[PDB]
Amino acid sequence: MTRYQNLVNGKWKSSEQEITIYSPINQEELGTVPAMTQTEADEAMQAARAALPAWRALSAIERAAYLHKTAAILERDKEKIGTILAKEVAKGIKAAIGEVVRTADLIRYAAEEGLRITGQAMEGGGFEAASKNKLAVVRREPVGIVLAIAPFNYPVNLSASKIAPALIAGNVVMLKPPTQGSISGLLLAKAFEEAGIPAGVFNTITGRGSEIGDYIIEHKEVNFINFTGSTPIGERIGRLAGMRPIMLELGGKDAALVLEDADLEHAAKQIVAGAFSYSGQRCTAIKRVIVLESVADKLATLLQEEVSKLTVGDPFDNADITPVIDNASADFIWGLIEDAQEKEAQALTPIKREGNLLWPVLFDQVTKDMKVAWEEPFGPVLPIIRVASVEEAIAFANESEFGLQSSVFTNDFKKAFEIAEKLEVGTVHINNKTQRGPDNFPFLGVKGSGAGVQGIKYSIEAMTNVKSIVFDVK
Amino acid sequence: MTRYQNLVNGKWKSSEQEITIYSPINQEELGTVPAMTQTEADEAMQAARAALPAWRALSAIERAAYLHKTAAILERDKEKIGTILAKEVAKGIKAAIGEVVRTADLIRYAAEEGLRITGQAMEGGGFEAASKNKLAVVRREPVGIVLAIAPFNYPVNLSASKIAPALIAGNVVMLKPPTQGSISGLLLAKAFEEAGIPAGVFNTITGRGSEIGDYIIEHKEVNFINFTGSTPIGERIGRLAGMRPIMLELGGKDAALVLEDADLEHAAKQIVAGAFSYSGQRCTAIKRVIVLESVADKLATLLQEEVSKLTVGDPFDNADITPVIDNASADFIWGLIEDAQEKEAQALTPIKREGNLLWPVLFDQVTKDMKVAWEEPFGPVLPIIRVASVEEAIAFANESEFGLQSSVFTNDFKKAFEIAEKLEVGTVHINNKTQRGPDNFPFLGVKGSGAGVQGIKYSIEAMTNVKSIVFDVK
Amino acid sequence: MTRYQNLVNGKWKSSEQEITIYSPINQEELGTVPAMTQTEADEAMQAARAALPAWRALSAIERAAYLHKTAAILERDKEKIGTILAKEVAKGIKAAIGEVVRTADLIRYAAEEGLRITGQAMEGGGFEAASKNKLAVVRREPVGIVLAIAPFNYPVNLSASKIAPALIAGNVVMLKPPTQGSISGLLLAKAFEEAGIPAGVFNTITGRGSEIGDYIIEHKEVNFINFTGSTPIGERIGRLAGMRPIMLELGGKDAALVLEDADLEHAAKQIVAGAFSYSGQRCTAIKRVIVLESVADKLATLLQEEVSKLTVGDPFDNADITPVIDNASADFIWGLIEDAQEKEAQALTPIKREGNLLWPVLFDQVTKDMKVAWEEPFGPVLPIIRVASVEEAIAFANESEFGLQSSVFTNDFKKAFEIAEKLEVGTVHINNKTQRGPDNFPFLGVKGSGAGVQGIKYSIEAMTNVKSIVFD
Amino acid sequence: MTRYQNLVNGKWKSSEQEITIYSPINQEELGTVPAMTQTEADEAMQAARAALPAWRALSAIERAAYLHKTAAILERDKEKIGTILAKEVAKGIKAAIGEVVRTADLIRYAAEEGLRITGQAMEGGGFEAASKNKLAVVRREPVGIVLAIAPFNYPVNLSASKIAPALIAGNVVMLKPPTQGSISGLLLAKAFEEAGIPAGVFNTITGRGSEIGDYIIEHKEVNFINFTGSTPIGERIGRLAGMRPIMLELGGKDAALVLEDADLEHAAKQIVAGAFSYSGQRCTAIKRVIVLESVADKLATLLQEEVSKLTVGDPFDNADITPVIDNASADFIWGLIEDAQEKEAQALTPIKREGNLLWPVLFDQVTKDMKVAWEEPFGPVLPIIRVASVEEAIAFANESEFGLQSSVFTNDFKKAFEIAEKLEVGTVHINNKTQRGPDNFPFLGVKGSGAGVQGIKYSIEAMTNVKSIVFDVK
Numbered sequence A, B, D: 001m002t003r004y005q006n007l008v009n010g011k012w013k014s015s016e017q018e019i020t021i022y023s024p025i026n027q028e029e030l031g032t033v034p035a036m037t038q039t040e041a042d043e044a045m046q047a048a049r050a051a052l053p054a055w056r057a058l059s060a061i062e063r064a065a066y067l068h069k070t071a072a073i074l075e076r077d078k079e080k081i082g083t084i085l086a087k088e089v090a091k092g093i094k095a096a097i098g099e100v101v102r103t104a105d106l107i108r109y110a111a112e113e114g115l116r117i118t119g120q121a122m123e124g125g126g127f128e129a130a131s132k133n134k135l136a137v138v139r140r141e142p143v144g145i146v147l148a149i150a151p152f153n154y155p156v157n158l159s160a161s162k163i164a165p166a167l168i169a170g171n172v173v174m175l176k177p178p179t180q181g182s183i184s185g186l187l188l189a190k191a192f193e194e195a196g197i198p199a200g201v202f203n204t205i206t207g208r209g210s211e212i213g214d215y216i217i218e219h220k221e222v223n224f225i226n227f228t229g230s231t232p233i234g235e236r237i238g239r240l241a242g243m244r245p246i247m248l249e250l251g252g253k254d255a256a257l258v259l260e261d262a263d264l265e266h267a268a269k270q271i272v273a274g275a276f277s278y279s280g281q282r283c284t285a286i287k288r289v290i291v292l293e294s295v296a297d298k299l300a301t302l303l304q305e306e307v308s309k310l311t312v313g314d315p316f317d318n319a320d321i322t323p324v325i326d327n328a329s330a331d332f333i334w335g336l337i338e339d340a341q342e343k344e345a346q347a348l349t350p351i352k353r354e355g356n357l358l359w360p361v362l363f364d365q366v367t368k369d370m371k372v373a374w375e376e377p378f379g380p381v382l383p384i385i386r387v388a389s390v391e392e393a394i395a396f397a398n399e400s401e402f403g404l405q406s407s408v409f410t411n412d413f414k415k416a417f418e419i420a421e422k423l424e425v426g427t428v429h430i431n432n433k434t435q436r437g438p439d440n441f442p443f444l445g446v447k448g449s450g451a452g453v454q455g456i457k458y459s460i461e462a463m464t465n466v467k468s469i470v471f472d473v474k
Numbered sequence C: 001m002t003r004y005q006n007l008v009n010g011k012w013k014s015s016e017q018e019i020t021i022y023s024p025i026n027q028e029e030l031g032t033v034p035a036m037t038q039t040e041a042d043e044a045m046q047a048a049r050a051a052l053p054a055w056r057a058l059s060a061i062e063r064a065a066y067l068h069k070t071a072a073i074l075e076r077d078k079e080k081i082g083t084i085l086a087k088e089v090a091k092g093i094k095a096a097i098g099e100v101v102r103t104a105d106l107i108r109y110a111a112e113e114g115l116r117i118t119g120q121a122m123e124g125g126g127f128e129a130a131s132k133n134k135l136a137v138v139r140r141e142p143v144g145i146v147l148a149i150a151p152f153n154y155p156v157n158l159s160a161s162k163i164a165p166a167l168i169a170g171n172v173v174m175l176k177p178p179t180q181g182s183i184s185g186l187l188l189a190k191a192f193e194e195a196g197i198p199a200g201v202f203n204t205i206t207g208r209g210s211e212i213g214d215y216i217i218e219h220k221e222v223n224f225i226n227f228t229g230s231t232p233i234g235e236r237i238g239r240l241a242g243m244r245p246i247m248l249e250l251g252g253k254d255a256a257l258v259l260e261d262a263d264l265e266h267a268a269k270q271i272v273a274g275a276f277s278y279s280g281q282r283c284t285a286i287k288r289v290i291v292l293e294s295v296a297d298k299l300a301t302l303l304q305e306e307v308s309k310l311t312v313g314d315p316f317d318n319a320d321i322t323p324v325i326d327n328a329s330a331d332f333i334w335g336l337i338e339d340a341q342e343k344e345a346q347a348l349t350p351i352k353r354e355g356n357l358l359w360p361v362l363f364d365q366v367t368k369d370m371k372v373a374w375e376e377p378f379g380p381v382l383p384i385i386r387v388a389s390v391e392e393a394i395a396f397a398n399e400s401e402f403g404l405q406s407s408v409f410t411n412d413f414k415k416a417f418e419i420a421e422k423l424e425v426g427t428v429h430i431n432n433k434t435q436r437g438p439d440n441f442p443f444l445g446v447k448g449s450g451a452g453v454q455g456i457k458y459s460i461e462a463m464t465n466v467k468s469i470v471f472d
């Protein structure tokens, strides 16, 4: 019933074509988002380019006032936004409200962090005596139009993590929310417009990525692409962008290296909390357990009982395991489970499917040959791999096509640091589950898990151009 | 006569196919460089990948010792290297020796700057109280194999500006010197090998870029591409690299905005020194003069007499204007001159050509329609454009397809700063000619003049991966 | 009538001895502040030392929540606080309310700036190969108890500029507001307590500095002294503190170097705005005009007419020139004026006194021998000095016993930068009046104008101890 | 026999009064240093003040060239300087040569670190919108004349650690070497003058600190006091300096907190290596062992055998334990030993004295009441204290009048970090002996162990004044 519209040039626009959004919980029609045509995307880019000069000419504090007001409105409407978000991405209702609250906190932190970007005043005298009187005043300037593309699992938090760092830096933002999540992206736009953001400073583009995505990625006006999504689409986007700056937050098959001298109870608690949070539908989540021979059986028992503790059901009952986003994802996860069963994997938990609602599957005795050891199921499946030495554990963790994060569970932290710089990942957590963590911490992946460093400071700095001004002081 | 070989795995290798290098001065055969096949490039990448672990496992100071020894050997052999460099790229002999000396100084500065890369120790308590006990130890780690590709005009200095920042960071370097300049790149390799660099840490790939370039750009092992060259090739490289990190230092049509309240004598001296240094064959050089109506005639007179002061002839006579690199470049520059003459441009200096040896041409009354106003001639041609206001000057400077650098000549520095952040360039020089400057200063271009920030600190940092290690301090 | 009490250990305490506060405007009794005894100061230090562990154990964000709430309460009560502040330091009422608003903004900025203090993770491999496997995790930790002592002219803003950077860093603060200004300091404490600051985290000590000041400066518990005041007291405090860390923001005789190629109208506007703001009772204010021979007459004419534009009267009429703080300050300023008149200084403006209410005096033809050329009058007097060259201008600016700030007025900014690093000051303003500026900018003096670098980032960092943790 | 002279105004000056230097080894006359009068100190300050402008007007790289030449000359003359240093402070000959080598390396690192001091370019727009157009160019400028005062144990290394960071920053240095060590300070001056340092840039003041020290501390010209010495003199200096900036590196009674889950063999090796290096005559050395009840006996046995391994004798035989500096120090250490024996301390090693040559004494069962538990013996005595809990260990470590450094020996590094921020010291070493470490690491003490942060970067920055230049960018 409810018509949703895109924020273009500060006013709400509908489109001729439309996409109907169905709840993953029970196929309930939640609304309709506009399927913008190519010319409407051109008009939205026009508006952003026209609004860029006045936005960039504001003070940093005047720019941050809008972000603070947006955060206040998000906090005020957290219940409604979280309810619709829970209905739309099959997220736990209280977890969805928590996502809205963390989004507000991220917007506030980004607003207050973009006020303190300090440049440099370099002297040439340290490099050569001929240049002793040269002073370079190095500062940061907006790249221009930032195109933010968000994934389904966090269409509010991972949209704001691109919008707020871009907006406080002086850029104007073009938001492309995921189709299953476009309602939540348009509610974030609802809040941004209610906060009084100037017309054209923040715009939304809704539509299928398979049809509108390439046009807006290759667009003339886009000066920066901040994309969070699957590796197949991230590779295509980084290949289509060419020379323009990009951030990619792609897939990740994060490992949990459990060593012999590890607190197996804490390790199991952390691994299950990270692995099966939001039905395994976080990309920064333990997707592999690489455990040595000695402690493998005890860790498998503890992991299996912890997975057995998980509640599986409706998002509004705050179930730990909720339905996966759509039927195709469930089919892919089921195919990985079937492959693992084919190759004699010890299923440590019941394997039941009720359509989208898959039950948490813990696999033991996983080898190289099962696709679940490599492919990111992006669902409630956790393979347990047994290795003989720390060298084999590091080798197996590094054979992945992914480098987002990893976690090392051990008591000797000197060995944990050694493994940490031997691991080809962007972040290593010692005795803790992998997570994006405090959003001031750097967040990056390396080997096909991304391209660029993000986190609030790093994303604010990376969506800006350095401009040096060199003059003579004597 | 003289056979030259590529440094592969610490030993010198020749190839079946060969490229003969002819002096641009008089078509003198200077030697032969190997035209490496695809499998030889594979072997060189193999060697770099194998040598990466031991190189990265060294101390920063042990790594910098090799760079200091290389700089000492370069200083020792500056006369021979500069003589062959002057013969090979038709550079002034004393200017070539100066390039070798600046290369040694750059290697020393990069070696001493990579010793001081300090990480961060971040706390989560400022973002959220739940994470008050989290500590992220953020540091830098090598990307891996850095593929450096150099242009002809500075095959030693712009090779070392990619090698030394990469080597001190812990990366291994694959050098692709330009074919007209490969001899000088192999002499830089000569010095690097004599300094005792470990086998496989620094390798060279010689051959035509049109045939070996795409293979090594798209190679499996290359973890970073540092390319300096023309914009057409830089766009292709940034498009072929896809998701891998790149630096591009592409073309630049730098402008010299001369305002009414400017020191026209100093402005003219600086503009001619920057524009016609090395026959206009520097990319960071004044290629446009955008001068207001009031001072245009006086500036044109001063510029024309300064260009008339220039000596045109042999590189070993230290002529200000030397032969351009090859016949194709001379033909392109001549075509631009012919277009300007077609469209009624006031040639302020004699227009004579003796093959590669073109004479400095100063054009006045240049409009939008002449290709010399837009295309980078990369030669001894300097168009003078007249505009009516500062707004038109800024608009015309920003209409270019390039954003490397610009210089603003005026006496009111407050207006100079205003213009400086209105200019869509990477660096603005106030009352000075554009230059790469002290190599600690940031050097970047924006609008198709590059992708990334370079300069010794920035290039050291940008050829490294961030690695965060997060643990509990409780 | 109104009894005021000190915030000690989160509860309000009165003292046996008392100080009565009289309005500099009309000697109106504004209230009474407690004259704390030595043992009461000991008890307050006890409370701060006891509250330090729990305060330091909070998150930075939990600590900043209290500062944000304090800023909100200050914004809410700006009218009342500014009214009492205007009555108490004879500041313009709208200027006083503006001071309260800037105080709230400073508290907010310090709270949000102390959340982002990031340490370092250093490696030993760049220094020596033997230490390639050593990692130093360098971070910041509170010094402990910070003793903040404020001057009269900004008893709210210059109190918060020491409290908020100290509180967000994890320190507990002992505030000593000026006696003429202690009411405003206790209103700032009123707001800090209403915001819910934990008991003992923020305490106030009221009393005469001449009697309680040395005891609390030399106290056992004080781990840091942040003092803003006159140079004679700052020298004594830096000498009594001994080895403990200190910040001093002492006197400053800031100069306005006006060169020949200068915009004399803009220069005169800026010089008069800086020099006679709050009756010259700001320490970061133009107190000297050093102008070359060529433009001296034009600059003197423009300066004299700008000073003639100034309104002199009641603070609640928002007069540009208000009564000076007390009779002793007026006597000192009058003595400097009398010396200048003795030595044949061209008084360019009327010289009238109505007790505390002095009228803005612009002096020309000032030489070395007049005390107004050197001594900080801290009042509405602006000497104009004429020099023959830029070298003499720089020399005369550097002969001062002060190094707070200076301003260079010229059109050639390359020459302005040259003069700027030839000037022995902490900050040089080019074509602008001297000011503390945006409180993120560094603020320091050098040659007896202070000791240390302040400004929100620098004050947050300088009230903390570095702690390195080195492991393999 | 050999007359030594002070470097004043670039030329060598003798004094009427003289101090004879006697070797602590065998009371051998090593030479005579001038006992400068007050007027000679005035003349030296005059020379420094006169040479300050030209020194400060040099390029940073021109300033660093002199430091590099000084380091080269020190490396060249390391054998002679180390021989005289070993004779003069009774240091091991090979240890003394190692000190000279580390001094050269410190001078080189400080020279290359002072070239890279980069300022800031701050904008007012983040604080208030009214100041959006203000730019502060914040940089560092020399304080002026730096008065460096060195202690006896490292009269070369701890002199250069004040001279090189001061000289590279643009300051001129007034060196006051210790009387027992003034010969080595004048040899460091020998090298500085041979390197060609400009006249008056580096001067030396020799004489008794008890007579010339207060005059030069309270001097008019001294703009900064960098003092390393005992706490009684440091308190006096910080009290006499008043408002002028100071660094103090005072005494330190560093503790070695050994917990139950600790590697007692490694802990004992590290504790004995730190505690008895140079006869306990380093200030950053383990002077207390605070060990829990459980592992106290095993740690005491291991410590006692490690101390029994130590060789006691002549410095030129490279003995681990060498004679203490003078008879008064030996008497003080003997008094502390006698007090410990009085109060029933278990002397775990032989207690023998041959004048200055004391033998390493390891005390067990040490309580609060023995002066050796609190007073810094500054000699070959190591008390072992037993405590019941970690809380008592932290309390006893914090009851000291000193806060230089401490070391925590344990296997659980999370507990080690917890103790580390509970310890009221400047540096905590985890599973390692305390040391000044790599001289890039910060070095500071807190509770009467100093005032200020030192280490090469921190000492370079702290001997400079911040200067902000604020202008309008429009």
Ligand SMILES: NC(=O)c1ccc[n+]([C@@H]2O[C@H](COP(=O)([O-])OP(=O)(O)OC[C@H]3O[C@@H](n4cnc5c(N)ncnc54)[C@H](OP(=O)(O)O)[C@@H]3O)[C@@H](O)[C@H]2O)c1
Pocket: A149, A150, A151, A152, A153, A154, A176, A177, A178, A179, A180, A207, A208, A209, A210, A212, A213, A214, A217, A228, A229, A230, A231, A233, A234, A236, A237, A249, A250, A251, A252, A282, A283, A284, A378, A404, A449
């Ligand atoms: N590392 C991280 O920070 C992080 C965090 C969370 C998730 N992820 C990743 O996100 C993925 C799941 O999200 P998803 O499946 O929704 O992402 P996806 O299908 O790969 O695409 C992500 C976003 O890009 C749009 N898109 C799709 N095709 C496109 C094209 N050809 N051109 C341009 N844009 C296009 C999508 O819109 P439509 O699909 O709605 O058309 C969606 O909004 C997982 O692979 C996970 O690894 C990464």
Ligand SMILES: NC(=O)c1ccc[n+]([C@@H]2O[C@H](COP(=O)([O-])OP(=O)(O)OC[C@H]3O[C@@H](n4cnc5c(N)ncnc54)[C@H](OP(=O)(O)O)[C@@H]3O)[C@@H](O)[C@H]2O)c1
Pocket: C149, C150, C151, C152, C153, C154, C158, C176, C177, C178, C179, C180, C207, C208, C209, C210, C211, C212, C213, C214, C217, C228, C229, C230, C231, C233, C237, C249, C250, C251, C252, C282, C283, C284, C378, C404
């Ligand atoms: N650079 C800056 O940032 C800055 C800014 C504003 C003002 N100032 C300076 O502030 C001065 C005017 O303030 P003022 O005259 O009120 O300051 P003051 O009399 O010199 O003393 C300043 C503060 O210290 C207290 N005090 C007085 N004697 C003391 C002692 N013996 N020991 C410890 N504390 C003592 C005072 O309290 P009581 O006097 O109430 O007892 C007052 O709160 C001017 O000289 C001006 O230069 C500097």
Ligand SMILES: NC(=O)c1ccc[n+]([C@@H]2O[C@H](COP(=O)([O-])OP(=O)(O)OC[C@H]3O[C@@H](n4cnc5c(N)ncnc54)[C@H](OP(=O)(O)O)[C@@H]3O)[C@@H](O)[C@H]2O)c1
Pocket: D149, D150, D151, D152, D153, D154, D176, D177, D178, D179, D180, D207, D208, D209, D210, D212, D213, D214, D217, D228, D229, D230, D231, D233, D237, D249, D250, D251, D252, D282, D283, D284, D376, D378, D404
């Ligand atoms: N934390 C560190 O970095 C560190 C490192 C090493 C040593 N230390 C400390 O150094 C001390 C041992 O050295 P020391 O006994 O030679 O030092 P000291 O006697 O306390 O004095 C240190 C230096 O100051 C001079 N001096 C003496 N009296 C003075 C006065 N009244 N005014 C000014 N200067 C004066 C001394 O010269 P003369 O004595 O020759 O006259 C000597 O050069 C120990 O207490 C140790 O804790 C600290």
